[PDB]
Enzyme design. Structure first.
Site, PDB file in Angstrom:
ATOM      1  CG  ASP A   6      -1.952   1.122   1.144  1.00 54.90           C
ATOM      2  OD1 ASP A   6      -2.659   1.154   0.117  1.00 54.90           O
ATOM      3  OD2 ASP A   6      -2.073   1.940   2.085  1.00 54.90           O
ATOM      4  CD  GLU A   8      -1.676   5.958   2.998  1.00 60.10           C
ATOM      5  OE1 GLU A   8      -2.473   6.758   2.467  1.00 60.10           O
ATOM      6  OE2 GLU A   8      -2.019   4.823   3.391  1.00 60.10           O
ATOM      7  CD  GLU A  55     -10.093  14.297  -1.787  1.00 58.98           C
ATOM      8  OE1 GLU A  55     -10.682  15.263  -2.315  1.00 58.98           O
ATOM      9  OE2 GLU A  55      -9.967  13.187  -2.348  1.00 58.98           O
ATOM     10  CG  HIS A  60      -1.962  10.647   4.517  1.00 57.59           C
ATOM     11  ND1 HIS A  60      -2.056  10.600   3.142  1.00 57.59           N
ATOM     12  CD2 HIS A  60      -1.421  11.851   4.816  1.00 57.59           C
ATOM     13  CE1 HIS A  60      -1.588  11.726   2.633  1.00 57.59           C
ATOM     14  NE2 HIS A  60      -1.196  12.501   3.628  1.00 57.59           N
ATOM     15  CG  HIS A 156      -6.721   5.346   5.566  1.00 54.42           C
ATOM     16  ND1 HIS A 156      -7.357   5.330   4.343  1.00 54.42           N
ATOM     17  CD2 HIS A 156      -7.688   5.167   6.495  1.00 54.42           C
ATOM     18  CE1 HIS A 156      -8.653   5.150   4.525  1.00 54.42           C
ATOM     19  NE2 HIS A 156      -8.881   5.048   5.822  1.00 54.42           N
ATOM     20  CG  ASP A 161      -4.048   1.624   5.065  1.00 59.99           C
ATOM     21  OD1 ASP A 161      -4.366   1.684   6.273  1.00 59.99           O
ATOM     22  OD2 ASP A 161      -4.353   2.511   4.236  1.00 59.99           O
TER      23      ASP A 161
HETATM   24  C1  TMP Z   1      -9.451   7.844   0.478  1.00 61.74           C
HETATM   25  C2  TMP Z   1      -8.702   8.910  -0.287  1.00 61.74           C
HETATM   26  C3  TMP Z   1      -7.420   8.663  -0.688  1.00 61.74           C
HETATM   27  N1  TMP Z   1      -6.634   9.621  -1.420  1.00 61.74           N
HETATM   28  C4  TMP Z   1      -5.204   9.331  -1.857  1.00 61.74           C
HETATM   29  C5  TMP Z   1      -4.159   9.978  -0.920  1.00 61.74           C
HETATM   30  C6  TMP Z   1      -3.751   8.854  -0.003  1.00 61.74           C
HETATM   31  O1  TMP Z   1      -2.475   8.943   0.566  1.00 61.74           O
HETATM   32  C7  TMP Z   1      -3.899   7.650  -0.853  1.00 61.74           C
HETATM   33  C8  TMP Z   1      -4.148   6.494   0.106  1.00 61.74           C
HETATM   34  O2  TMP Z   1      -5.387   5.823  -0.007  1.00 61.74           O
HETATM   35  P1  TMP Z   1      -5.485   4.709   1.088  1.00 61.74           P
HETATM   36  O3  TMP Z   1      -5.382   5.105   2.723  1.00 61.74           O
HETATM   37  O4  TMP Z   1      -6.980   4.332   0.734  1.00 61.74           O
HETATM   38  O5  TMP Z   1      -4.435   3.476   0.834  1.00 61.74           O
HETATM   39  O6  TMP Z   1      -4.984   7.894  -1.787  1.00 61.74           O
HETATM   40  C9  TMP Z   1      -7.188  10.888  -1.754  1.00 61.74           C
HETATM   41  O7  TMP Z   1      -6.620  11.780  -2.369  1.00 61.74           O
HETATM   42  N2  TMP Z   1      -8.504  11.100  -1.325  1.00 61.74           N
HETATM   43  C10 TMP Z   1      -9.326  10.201  -0.603  1.00 61.74           C
HETATM   44  O8  TMP Z   1     -10.468  10.545  -0.299  1.00 61.74           O
HETATM   45 MN    MN Z   2      -3.445   3.516   2.644  1.00 64.03          MN
HETATM   46 MN    MN Z   3      -4.285   2.068  -0.695  1.00 63.14          MN
END
Ligand code: TMP
Ligand code: MN
Ligand code: MN
Length: 174
Positions: A6, A8, A55, A60, A156, A161
């Site tokens: 995973d 971020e 966002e 995270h 997160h 994750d």
């Molecule tokens: C859930 C979500 C994730 N993201 C991007 C930035 C996060 O670091 C990345 C991680 O998603 P995750 O915690 O679902 O693995 O996806 C957004 O830009 N907006 C959102 O609403």
């Molecule tokens: Mn994640």
């Molecule tokens: Mn992810």
């Protein structure tokens, strides 16, 4: 080897290539061999040299200041490739992370091939949707379905994750 992974990021785009102009800020990967966590993982925070979108921060909680002293993707790329090479990567919504990985690899200008050319890629979200059609299949929904603890997941985290997904995926395929 199976590597549950995973990442971020600083955010994502709703139109066009989702990774364009964004950066990976954390990589978390967990090794599974013969259906057992080995404990030998990969976990790094990276300096993006750009700001994290609001966002993304809401997801995270990784502050810009915390990444200032971290390594760049270029500095961890070699070991990262040594870790994942030849394994079956298990990622929830694989196209998202793979897109960012290939994007970051391409910026290195080292002629690095696409990840799916040296790794098998399994999208655990597609797997879950196939097993549970018409149901919620977010990682959190799967945690409830398989009784996996996600109480420490208010915010997160890549390794957090990846560990949770590893438990979920083992149960899904167990
Ligand atoms: C859930 C979500 C994730 N993201 C991007 C930035 C996060 O670091 C990345 C991680 O998603 P995750 O915690 O679902 O693995 O996806 C957004 O830009 N907006 C959102 O609403
Ligand atoms: Mn994640
Ligand atoms: Mn992810």
């Amino acid at each position: 080897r199976q590597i549950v992974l995973d990442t971020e990021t600083t955010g994502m785009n709703q139109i066009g290539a989702h990774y364009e102009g964004h950066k990976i800020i954390e990589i978390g990967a967990v090794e599974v061999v013969n259906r057992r966590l080995t404990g030998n993982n990969f976990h790094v925070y990276l300096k993006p040299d750009r700001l994290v979108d609001p966002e993304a921060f809401g997801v995270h909680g990784i502050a810009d200041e915390f990444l200032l002293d971290k390594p760049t993707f270029a500095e961890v790329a070699d070991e990262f490739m040594d870790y994942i090479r030849g394994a079956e990567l298990v990622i929830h919504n694989a196209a998202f992370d793979i897109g960012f990985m290939d994007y970051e690899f391409s910026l290195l200008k080292r002629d690095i091939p696409k990840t799916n050319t040296f790794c098998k890629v399994t999208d655990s979200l597609a797997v879950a949707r196939k097993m549970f059609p018409g149901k919620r299949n977010s990682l959190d929904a799967l945690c409830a379905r398989y009784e996996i603890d996600n109480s420490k997941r208010t915010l997160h985290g890549a390794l957090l994750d990846a560990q949770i997904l590893a438990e979920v995926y083992l149960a899904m395929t167990g």
